[PDB]
Scaffold this motif. Sequence first.
Motif, short mmCIF file in Angstrom:
data_model
loop_
_atom_site.label_atom_id
_atom_site.label_comp_id
_atom_site.label_asym_id
_atom_site.label_seq_id
_atom_site.Cartn_x
_atom_site.Cartn_y
_atom_site.Cartn_z
N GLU A 132 -1.39 3.59 -0.64
CA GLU A 132 -1.24 4.83 0.29
C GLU A 132 -0.56 4.63 1.63
O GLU A 132 -0.94 3.72 2.06
CB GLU A 132 -2.67 5.37 0.37
N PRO A 133 0.35 5.30 1.79
CA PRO A 133 1.36 5.08 2.91
C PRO A 133 0.67 5.33 4.27
O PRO A 133 0.86 4.95 5.40
CB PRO A 133 2.50 6.00 2.81
N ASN A 134 -0.40 6.58 4.24
CA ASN A 134 -0.87 6.95 5.54
C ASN A 134 -1.57 5.65 6.25
O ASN A 134 -1.23 5.70 7.37
CB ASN A 134 -1.96 7.98 5.24
N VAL A 135 -2.15 5.01 5.74
CA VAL A 135 -2.89 3.65 6.39
C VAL A 135 -1.97 2.83 7.20
O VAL A 135 -2.16 2.54 8.37
CB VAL A 135 -3.78 2.97 5.49
N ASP B 145 1.17 3.66 7.77
CA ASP B 145 1.76 4.28 8.94
C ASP B 145 1.07 4.32 10.14
O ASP B 145 1.63 4.09 11.52
CB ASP B 145 2.21 5.68 8.21
N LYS C 42 4.00 4.92 -2.53
CA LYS C 42 4.22 6.46 -2.51
C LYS C 42 3.33 6.99 -3.04
O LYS C 42 3.45 8.20 -3.31
CB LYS C 42 5.73 6.82 -2.47
N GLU C 43 2.46 6.65 -3.89
CA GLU C 43 1.48 7.14 -4.72
C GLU C 43 0.16 6.30 -4.68
O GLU C 43 0.12 5.15 -4.79
CB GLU C 43 1.68 7.31 -6.42
N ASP C 44 -1.10 7.20 -4.55
CA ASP C 44 -2.25 6.22 -4.59
C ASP C 44 -2.72 6.07 -5.97
O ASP C 44 -2.09 6.41 -7.18
CB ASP C 44 -3.44 7.41 -3.71
N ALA D 20 -5.96 6.85 -6.72
CA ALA D 20 -7.09 7.71 -6.58
C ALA D 20 -8.33 6.79 -6.23
O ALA D 20 -8.17 5.83 -5.37
CB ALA D 20 -7.39 8.29 -7.76
#
Lengths: 427, 440
Positions: free
Chosen positions: B72-75, B77, B97-99, B101
Amino acid sequence: MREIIHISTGQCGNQIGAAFWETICGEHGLDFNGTYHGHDDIQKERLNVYFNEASSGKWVPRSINVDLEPGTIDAVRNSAIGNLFRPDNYIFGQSSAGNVWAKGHYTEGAELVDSVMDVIRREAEGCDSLQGFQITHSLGGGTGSGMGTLLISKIREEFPDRMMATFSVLPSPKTSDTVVEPYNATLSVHQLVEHSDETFCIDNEALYDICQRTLKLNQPSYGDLNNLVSSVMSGVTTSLRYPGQLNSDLRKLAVNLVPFPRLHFFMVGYAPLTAIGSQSFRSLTVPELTQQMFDAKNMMAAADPRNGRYLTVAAFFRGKVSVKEVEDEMHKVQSKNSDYFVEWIPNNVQTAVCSVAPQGLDMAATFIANSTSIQELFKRVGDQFSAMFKRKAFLHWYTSEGMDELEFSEAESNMNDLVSEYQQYQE
Amino acid sequence: MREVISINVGQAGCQIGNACWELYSLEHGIKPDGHLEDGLSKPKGGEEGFSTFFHETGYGKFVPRAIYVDLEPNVIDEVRNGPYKDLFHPEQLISGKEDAANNYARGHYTVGREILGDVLDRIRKLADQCDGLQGFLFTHSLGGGTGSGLGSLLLEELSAEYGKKSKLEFAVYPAPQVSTSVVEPYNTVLTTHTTLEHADCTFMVDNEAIYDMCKRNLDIPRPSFANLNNLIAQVVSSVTASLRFDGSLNVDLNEFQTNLVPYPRIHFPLVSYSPVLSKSKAFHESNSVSEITNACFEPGNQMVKCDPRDGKYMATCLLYRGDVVTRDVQRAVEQVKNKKTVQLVDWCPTGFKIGICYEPPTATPNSQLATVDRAVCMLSNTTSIAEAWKRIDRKFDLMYAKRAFVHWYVGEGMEEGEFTEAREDLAALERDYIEVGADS
Ligand SMILES: C/C(=C\c1csc(C)n1)[C@@H]1C[C@@H]2O[C@@H]2CCC[C@H](C)[C@H](O)[C@@H](C)C(=O)C(C)(C)[C@@H](O)CC(=O)O1
Ligand SMILES: Nc1nc2c(ncn2[C@@H]2O[C@H](COP(=O)(O)OP(=O)(O)OP(=O)(O)O)[C@@H](O)[C@H]2O)c(=O)[nH]1
Ligand SMILES: Nc1nc2c(ncn2[C@@H]2O[C@H](COP(=O)(O)OP(=O)(O)O)[C@@H](O)[C@H]2O)c(=O)[nH]1
């Protein structure tokens, strides 16, 4: 799983889409002329989820507005917020479907089709990584049901591994405005169970009941109900466009909420809800929000949730929320009310948190429940359908477009199968 | 030994790693810009502490040996925009670019394998730079998609490549009562299947127990994940303290494995941190060695939801920091042994190994943990741990009877017999654990 494509279909779907886009622009601080007003790192980075950045810094939403009645799209184009949309994403034919699922599904729906698929392909090429599709329409229309289901079939045919999340507006058990709506709805669910990955069922009567009961309204309007639906839509995707403690994804929603492919149907609820002027007499507490979310009056589907049993639950909190608080209140609801939660699955409910607060409140929560009570709705429509199909009333409108009675019988059989499976897992 | 490399997988693992690295920089006195200012030399900010983790690059700037993996890129970032974005080499952060889940099958068999080669190459380059690699330190979320799947896959590959390096794993376990994931037990069982055969030493932390410590001992009204992570980070820091500073009895990781691991399996100790003292209560406490040792064996000071009194203690290791007399520690250990609630197994004459490190502990500003002149970490192998596994197994069984969520895993390239095999292996592990631990 970054970029999401929104597709609105029909009168109802287009109106809901307008409300939704207004809400998204308000959250991200965008002017209705496409030039951003505010851009904060939490708003600015994830702008790419719903929006493409056109040249000269003008942001345009990735959206497709389709109907067979030109008047609705004309009204949208002449409204303020009519500027935001690139004029190429409006697609409409001259002759409507009346309300007949058959016309929109093949006969008069084939008038558009390919153009919509072409603009979908262009939007897909313009995105780095597709995440899924949001499809907003009304079950029980001519255009929203028929053209919508057909479009879903085409999209899944071309993009089989992308999430299909449909927000369906169902018939109301008390006094619907459309006569042949049961036929359309049954025909639509036939395809919907074979294509959609997750379908959020909403009915207008429950929304009206929320409006008058909790909110003490004088004469609600459709835009008012659409605002509720838009808030729920926003709540679902919050973790995609914003940071948080426990982030969530559409695939994650499907994994946690879907034990069997044939149970993808969900009830939604939202908290808080308080009538005007008594806002000062309220306290926003995670326990209070939880109470609001499990209250049967705050279900947006017309089923009785206490009658059925909860299979899987997914809660989403926004604003100032401790994970520990959510764990505590959630487990209290699980233990106290354990008659409503299926014993076969030990973890009945899962939680997600987003630090950003919705505009106007420090704390809010969305509630997604997969319960057996939904079967009730399937039963009601079914009965109606069977009744009318016994007299073969209105059938000539459908069979004149190339339909067969075998298709209707198959659809009713599929509905009965769905109800039977929900009964099986209710146990 | 010299160098240790940290590896963080998943949201939880990356957050824990952030807290741990912040704590290490505080202990050694390293600026958030990666500068030896804050004291420049000697074991706090010196070659003793700089070896093991931090790597000195040109211009005297220190980059930690750390590898962040998230699908997951958000973390990552968020980490890239935070204050400690400066500390580490930008190429050590690896974003997908993909989790997954929460699906162990995608992190292990499909989406995780797309990043696997790149992260392995990164590990190989960093290992090349390391002069005298001791081993690796893993930060997981057991039961997630990325931590479970990518963590197990990566750990197996790393063991295949190196194999004689010590492999430590610090895992965040599912909660016996209140959990946030519907399929979490599936993931946990599947991961334990591999973790038992690859990880050399595994540390387990239940978030429920840490919440109990925050609310009861620290009297924190609204605890956050950050405070929990701070406690865990202090535990890990105290594990490596004997490597980073001088002392009386200097414990290595190999010594931990030797004294705490009687057989190839049963490598899963519980951990406890005794001086958890609210800043409100900071002036009402003695800080006596005996008192701290007594606090260690109090269940309220344990970081797993397990009753250690219900089982038998196989072997334990206390690790003391700060101003502590060896004789006092020995006397306290003897008293604890005389309590008889330890229930020491017959094979072990002592079963209590004492490390002593001459450096005092320090705490991050966000926590109510007050500074103390001595501290203790408790690593114990007990039979009672089987309870946790049993719990997990039960939650697995009820789902697996109806094949509840199976299709989500099977669609990603898994087999049903794999589930049966993993559950069977877990049951065998529990059975052998009880068998040896009872008659040891
Ligand atoms: C302002 C609201 C709640 C609230 C504020 S402080 C607190 C404890 N609860 C919610 C917000 C929800 O998004 C929904 C708007 C719903 C509007 C109604 C359907 C209707 O259109 C409107 C005229 C109303 O009846 C209210 C204005 C009373 C609206 O505030 C109802 C409500 O609680 O909305
Ligand atoms: N100690 C601690 N536990 C956490 C934290 N965040 C989540 N957890 C726990 O880890 C599990 C949730 O895992 P996730 O964070 O959703 O996922 P992941 O394992 O990091 O992997 P992804 O789902 O791919 O992001 C639950 O047991 C949580 O309570 C954290 O910051 N600290
Ligand atoms: N929530 C909501 N429901 C709507 C709206 N417009 C129509 N509906 C519902 O949709 C059904 C009527 O179908 P309709 O929108 O005319 O279908 P169409 O012919 O395909 O455009 C009934 O259930 C209506 O109450 C709207 O703006 N909001």
